[PDB]
Amino acid sequence: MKIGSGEKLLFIGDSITDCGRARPEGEGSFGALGTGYVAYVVGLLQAVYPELGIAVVNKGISGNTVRDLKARWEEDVIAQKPDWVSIMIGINDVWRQYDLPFMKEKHVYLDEYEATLRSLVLETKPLVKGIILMTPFYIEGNEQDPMRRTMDQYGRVVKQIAEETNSLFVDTQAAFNEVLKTLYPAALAWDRVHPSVAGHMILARAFLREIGFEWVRSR
Amino acid sequence: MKIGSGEKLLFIGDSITDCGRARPEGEGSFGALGTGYVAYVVGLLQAVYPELGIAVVNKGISGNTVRDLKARWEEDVIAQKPDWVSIMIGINDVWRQYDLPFMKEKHVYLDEYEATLRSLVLETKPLVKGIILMTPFYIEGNEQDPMRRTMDQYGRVVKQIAEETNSLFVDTQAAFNEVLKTLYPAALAWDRVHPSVAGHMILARAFLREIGFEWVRSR
C-alpha cells in the first residue's frame, strides 16, 4: 500500500474523473466524489483498508484538457495541500483534434501537452508526498485507428514523465486493451470514451493494483 | 421528382428515422416529424416543391430491429395507406451483436434479416406506388472494424432486395464513406451511429437524390 495513513489523496482530470462530483469542493461525502472510478477506489480502500485513514478530494472537471488543468492548478491542487495527487488528462487534448478538427484552438497538441503536464508535475512534486500519473485512454482495440494511435502517443508522454519524475504510473490503456480482447468497444462505451460501471471498475482496479492494494490482505 | 402531389410518404426505421417524432401518429407538423433527416427532407421538398402537397408520416421507433418492424407493420404501415414507404433498418439488428454480444436473443442475424425485410417489401409492394429501401450504416471508415464489416453485409442484402423487387435504393453507407475520406467518425457521431445535423443532412440528401429532387428545378 503506497499511500500512508492519515494522508490526503486528490484526484484531478476530466469527465472520467469528474463523474458528477460536487462543485467546487469535491469532498465531504461519496455523493461529493461522483459516481465512477474515484468513488470506487475510495470505497474499496475503505472496505479493505479502513484504518488507512485517508482524506479524499475529487477535482475532476468535464471537458478539461491539460491546458484547463494548468489554469486552475493553484486553486484546485496546490492550495488543497494534498499529500498525493493523481492526474488523468489527455482524452480531450486528443479527442478535439478528431471531433472538432477545424476548431484548432480547442486542440492541445503533443508539444503543449508534454510541456504543460511536465511542468505541472515538476512544480507539484516538491510540495507533496507522491504523484500518480494515469494515462489517458481510448476504448478501441485497433492500434491503427488514428485516435487510438494518437492517444497511445499521449500515453507514452505520460509514462516518460512518470519515469523521469519517479511518479507512480497507471497504464489505463493496457487495462482496457486486456478486456478488448474479448469485447467490442461498444459493449463498454458507445462513444469509446465514457464507459459503463464496468469501465469504471477496469479503471479503479488498475489504479488500486498500482498503489499496492490487495483484495485479500495477507497479514 | 418521383413523388406526386396529394401522395402520402411514410418513413419507418429506428432512432435514426424516429429523432423524437410524435407518438403514435408521427404526422401533422414538423415537430411531429422529429428533428433529423425526415424533417429535413420534408422541409427541402416544401422549400423547393411547395406546390406538391405531400402528406408525410414518421413511424420510426428508437431501438427497433427488422423483427420489431414486422411486429408492428399492420398498424404502423398498412393501416396508414401510404403511397410511398421508406425503410431504414438494420443498425440495431447488428449493433446488439456487438454491444450485447451474450444476449443472443436480441440479435437479428443476417438470414432472418434478409427474409424478414424481403417479406415486408413483398407484402407492401402491391399496395403502394413505390418503396424506397435505405441501407443501414455505421459511421466507421475502416472496412475491417467488425461492426462496420457486418453492417456492409446487411447493406448488401438491402441492395439485392431492392434490385429483385424493383424498389428505390439508397446506399447510406457509401454516402458516409465519401465524407469519411476526410472526417474521423467522431466528428459526425461519437457513438458511430447517431449523427450531428451534418449526418442527418447526408441522409436527407441521399434520399432526395434517389427520388429525383432537384436543388434548382429546370423544367
Place this chain on the structure above:
Amino acid sequence: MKIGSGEKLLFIGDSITDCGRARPEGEGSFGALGTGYVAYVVGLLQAVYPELGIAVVNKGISGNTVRDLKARWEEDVIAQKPDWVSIMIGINDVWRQYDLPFMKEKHVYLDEYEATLRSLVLETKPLVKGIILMTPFYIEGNEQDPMRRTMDQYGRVVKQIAEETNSLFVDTQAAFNEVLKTLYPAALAWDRVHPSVAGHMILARAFLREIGFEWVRSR
C-alpha cells in the same frame, strides 16, 4: 465556393439566426449552432464539402435590432477574429414600429438603421476576408402591406450597402416571395416572421446559392 478552406465563418443577427444557439459562445457543436438556417447551412456544407475545413460561430440573439448589434460588436464579432461575417438584421428594427407603435424608443428608423449597419460593415471589412449581407424579410406576399413595404425598404438599404462595399448579398425576401406564389404566409409562419423548418430551408438554400454551393459538385 466563396468560402475558403480553413476559414472561420461567424453568423450574427436576431432570433432567425439565434434559433436557441448556446450562449455566450455559440460554437463547439451543432447543439451550439441552434436549430435553424445556420445549422442547416453548416450541415449541408459538411455533407457536401467536408474538406472545406470551416469553423463556425453563431452569435444571433433573439430580439436584436442593429442598435443591439452595434452595442456588442466588439466582443461578439471583432474579438472572435472571423474570416467571414454574415449579418441578417432589420426584422425587429421594422417589426417594433408596427407591433409596438407607441414605444418609439424600441424602433430603429431607416436613418439609424442605414448609418449603423453601414458603419459596422465599413469597420469590419478591413479586418476580415469577406462579409455576407442578408436582407431582413417578412413572409407576406402583398407588397402594399405596410410592414412588407417598410421591410422591402430596409432590404434596399442592405443591398446598396452590399454593392458599395463589395459584400456578398442574399435577398431573403426574394427567396420567400418565390414560395409565396404558391403558399399563403400562415403555411410557413403564423406570425409572418418565425417560420417552420421549411422557412429555414428557404433561408439556408438562399445563403448557399450565394456562396457558390453546389448540391452535386461537377468536378
Place this chain on the structure above:
Amino acid sequence: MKIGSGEKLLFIGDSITDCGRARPEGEGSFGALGTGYVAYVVGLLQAVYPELGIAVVNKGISGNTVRDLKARWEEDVIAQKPDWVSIMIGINDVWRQYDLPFMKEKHVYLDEYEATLRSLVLETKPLVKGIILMTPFYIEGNEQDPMRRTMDQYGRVVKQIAEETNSLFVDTQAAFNEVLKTLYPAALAWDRVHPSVAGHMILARAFLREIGFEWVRSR
C-alpha cells in the same frame, strides 16, 4: 341586460373562447374560465351587476371547427342545461384552408359550415332562453387578403343565421375593423388570430354591448 339572475350562460368555440379554461368542466372559478374574453365578461358582469348571480361555463376547445362542435354538442352543451348559449366558431374552419392548404379533409367549407352551424342553433333554440352568435374574425385590415376575404364570407353566414333564427348577434370582425383603422394587426396579434388583452377586451365589450350591459347603470 338580457341575462337574468340565476341563469346559466355557456360559451363555446375554439382557442379564442378556451384561453386555458379547465377541462372538462370549464366552470366554478375564474381560473376555470381561462384568461380571455369569457373571464373578462364575467368579471365585468360581477363588477357592475353583482346581484345577478349568473352561472358561467366555458366549453371552448382550442383547434375546433364547427364540425368539432357538432361532435361534442350533446355532452358539452345540451347536458349542461344552459339558459344562454354563446357560439364563436369559424376561425379554424377557415385557417386550415390557408395554413394546411393540401390537407383538405381538415377544411370545413362554407356550405358545410353554414348547415352545421344552422343545425346547432336549431337544435338548441327550443331548450334555451337565447342564443348569441358571434362571428369569427381575422385581425387583418385588408379585405382582399385571401384569408380575411374568406373569413368575411363565413361571418356573413353567421349574420344570416342569427337574423333567420332570431339569435343575438355579435359582429366581431367589425369591432376589430374599427381598431384596425389605427393599429397594424401585429400590435393586436402576431398571428392575426390570437390577440393580446386588448383584443380580448374588444371581444368582451362587443359581447356585453349586445346583451345590454351598461358600464354605469341608469335605472
Place this chain on the structure above:
Amino acid sequence: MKIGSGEKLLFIGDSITDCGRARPEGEGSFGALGTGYVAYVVGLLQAVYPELGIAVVNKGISGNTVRDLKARWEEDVIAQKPDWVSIMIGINDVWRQYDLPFMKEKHVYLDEYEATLRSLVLETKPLVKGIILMTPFYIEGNEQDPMRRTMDQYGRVVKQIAEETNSLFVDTQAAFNEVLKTLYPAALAWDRVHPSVAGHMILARAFLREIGFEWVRSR
C-alpha cells in the same frame, strides 16, 4: 379623456398593481403588464381609444409600502420619464400593523406614510404632466373593523394630498363599498385584499371613470 395622445403612463404600487408584471422593465407587452387592473385598463383604452397612442409601464412590486416606493423612486419612476404617474400604495403600510403587529419595523405608521407620499408627489409633479392617486383599500364592509378603519384613514391622506397637489384621485374604497352592499368580502377576496378578476375590474373601471374614459364614445 385626461390622458393625451403620445403620453407615457407609469403605474406603481404593491402586489395589486404588480400582478406578475415583468421585472425589472415592466413594459413591452401585456405579458409584461401583469394580469390585473393595469392590464385591464390598458386593454380597454386600446379597445376603445386605440388612436390615443399611449406607452405604458408597470412598476408595481409585491409587498411594497410607501417606504419601499421611496427607496426605488429615482430609478423606477423619475428615470423612466413618464408623463403620467399613477400610484396605489398603503395596503401593506396598514396590513403589517395587523398581520405582524409585533414586528414594528415592518409597519409604516400614518406620519411616515403622509410625509413620504406627500414628498414623492411634490417632487414628481414638476417633472410630469399629471399624477393619479389611488387610495389603498380593504375589501371589508364594516367601517368599524380595525383594519378597514385604519385603511379609510390612510385613504383620507391620499385624498387630501390629491386635493392639495391638484392630482387626479380614485377612491378605490368607494368602488369596493358599492359592491359590498351585495357581496360578502370572501366572494371577491378570501383575504380581503387580493381579489378575483371581478375585483380587478372594479379597480380598472374606477380608474377609467376618473380619467374620463367612455365605454361608448359620444363623438
Place this chain on the structure above:
Amino acid sequence: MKIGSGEKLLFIGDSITDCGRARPEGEGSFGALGTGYVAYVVGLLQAVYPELGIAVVNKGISGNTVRDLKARWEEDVIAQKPDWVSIMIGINDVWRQYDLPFMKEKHVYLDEYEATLRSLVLETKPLVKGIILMTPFYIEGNEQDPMRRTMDQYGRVVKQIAEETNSLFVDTQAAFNEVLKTLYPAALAWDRVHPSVAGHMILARAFLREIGFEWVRSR
C-alpha cells in the same frame, strides 16, 4: 388521558384537518398525517406518552362539507375500524353561503347539517370507544360579521349533538375567541379560515385538553 394503548384514533374533516395528508390512506408516518393540528397532536402524544402506542389516521379532505363526509363515511371511517373518531366539519358548509352566495346547491344549511352530523354520530357510536366533536370556527372576533354569526349557529348545533350523544366536545371557536381578544384575525389567518402554525397549535391544544392530556404528567 382518555385514549388507551393500542387504540386507533381517526380524524376526519375538511382542509383544516387534511393539511396535505397522504391520500387515500392518511396513515403510517408524520408526513402522511399532513402538517397541522393532527400531526401536532400526535407529536405531543408521542413526546409525552411514548408508551401509548396509538395508531392515527387522517381522513381529512379539503373542500368537504358534512354532505361530503356522509358520502364517504363507509370507506373512510367505518372500514378503518377506529376506536376513536374526531370530527371537525362545517366551515365549508357555511363558507359557500358567503363566497358563492348564488351557487345554492353547494350550500349545506343548518337543518341538513344538523341531521346529517347527528346521523354520522349515531351510526358510528356503537362501533367505537368514543367520539370527539370539534366545532367549526371562523377566525373573526366580531360576532355580528355575517359568516362568524352563521358559524356560531353551526357550532351551537355541534355542542347540542355532543351533549345528546355523550360525545367528547371541543369548542374551537371559543379557543380562537380568547386569542382574538389580542390579535386581529389576519395575524392568524389572512382568509379567516386557514391558519398559521399558531392556529394549528390552538386547535391541537384544545383537542388535547379535551382528551385529558397533561403537559407534565402527575401519576
Place this chain on the structure above:
Amino acid sequence: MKIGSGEKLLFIGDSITDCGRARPEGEGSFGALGTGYVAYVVGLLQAVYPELGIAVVNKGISGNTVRDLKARWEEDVIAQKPDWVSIMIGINDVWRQYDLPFMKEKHVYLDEYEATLRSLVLETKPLVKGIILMTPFYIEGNEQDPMRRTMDQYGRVVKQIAEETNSLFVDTQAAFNEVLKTLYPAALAWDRVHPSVAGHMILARAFLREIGFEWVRSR
C-alpha cells in the same frame, strides 16, 4: 414566563434549528421560521400567550458548527439587535469526528468549542436581555456509545457556560433520554440526530419548560 412583552427572540443553531427557515432573513411568517421546534415554540407561545407581543427570528443554518456561528455572528445575531438569543450548537462539531473521522478540518474539538462558544456568549451578554443555551444532543440511549459520550461532554460545556454567565439552560439530552426509556432511537430518528415531529415537540417542550411556559395559565 422569562421572556417579556415586546421583546425580540432570535434562535441560532444548525439544521435542528434551521428546519427550512427562509434565507437570509428568517423572519416575517411561520413559513419563514421553518417546520420544527422553533416554529412550534413560537406557535405555542402565540396560542397560550398571545399578548406577549414577541418578535421572532430564526438564523439556524444546516451543517453549522460553532466555528460557523462565529464567522457569521456579527451579521446574523449582533446586528439583528435581539433581546434574547437562544443557541443550540455542537451536534456537527461532534458528528464530523465520527462520520468523517479523517477530514480533521471539519471537526471542532472540545477546546475550540468551549473557547468559541464561551466567547460568543460573553460578547453577546452585555448587548441583550438574556441568553438561552441549549445543549446539543444525540438520540441514543447508551451512554457508552462513543458519539453519545462525546456529545454529553459537549453538553457539560454548555451547562458550565450557562452557569458562569447566568444564562438560561435547556438540557435537550435529558429530554430525549426520558423518551429513550421507552423508545429505541430509530422510532424518533433513523440517524439519531434529525427527528420526527415528535422529536421537535420534545425539543419545543424542553425549551418552553425552561422559559416558564405554562400549558394552562393559573392566573
Place this chain on the structure above:
Amino acid sequence: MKIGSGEKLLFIGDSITDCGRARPEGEGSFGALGTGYVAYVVGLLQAVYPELGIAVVNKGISGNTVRDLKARWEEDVIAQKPDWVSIMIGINDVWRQYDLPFMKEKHVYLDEYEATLRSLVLETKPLVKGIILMTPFYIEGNEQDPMRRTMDQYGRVVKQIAEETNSLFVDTQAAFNEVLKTLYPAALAWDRVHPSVAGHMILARAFLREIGFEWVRSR
C-alpha cells in the same frame, strides 16, 4: 468462479439490493441494476471475467420483509428462470420492531422469518444451479444494542438454513464487524442500514468472495 457463462444470476431483497433499480424488470443495463452492491458485482465480473456472459436481474424492493418476498416469489423469481438466486432479507423484518414498535402487524418475528425463508429456499432449489443466502446486517458494533442483537439472531437463522440446504452463504454482518473495529457506524451509514459506496463495496466483495471471484485470475 461458481457462475458459468450464459447463466442468469438474480438478486432479490430490500432497498439494499434495490438501490433505485428499474421496475418491474430490473435487467438490461447498469442503470436498470441500480447504484449499489448488485451493480458493483456485475461491473467487477465484467471487468475481470468479460468472457462470462452472465445475465443479471435485480428484483430488490425497498421496504420488503421476507413476508413480502413470499408474496411476489412466483412472478419475480420463479418466472424469471434464473440459474442462481441471491437472497438478502431481514433488515426490515427486524427494523420495524424497533422503529414502529407498536405496529406489531408490520413485524416479522424470528419464527415466521425462519420458516418463510426456509420455504423459499426449498421451493427454489430444485429449479436452480444454486442459491446464495446473504445475512441481513446492522451497522452497529455494539452486540448489545437491541436491534444489532436481534439482527444477529436472524443472521444465525440464515446461516443454519444455508448449512441445511447446501446454499452458498455470505455473512454480511461479520464483514461489517471487521470495518467497525475502526469506523464508527455513522462513517458508513447515518441510519445504520443504508450505506455509502464503501458499504456497498463491503457487500459486493463479500458476495464475490463467496462465489469464487479472483481479483487477479491465476489459471
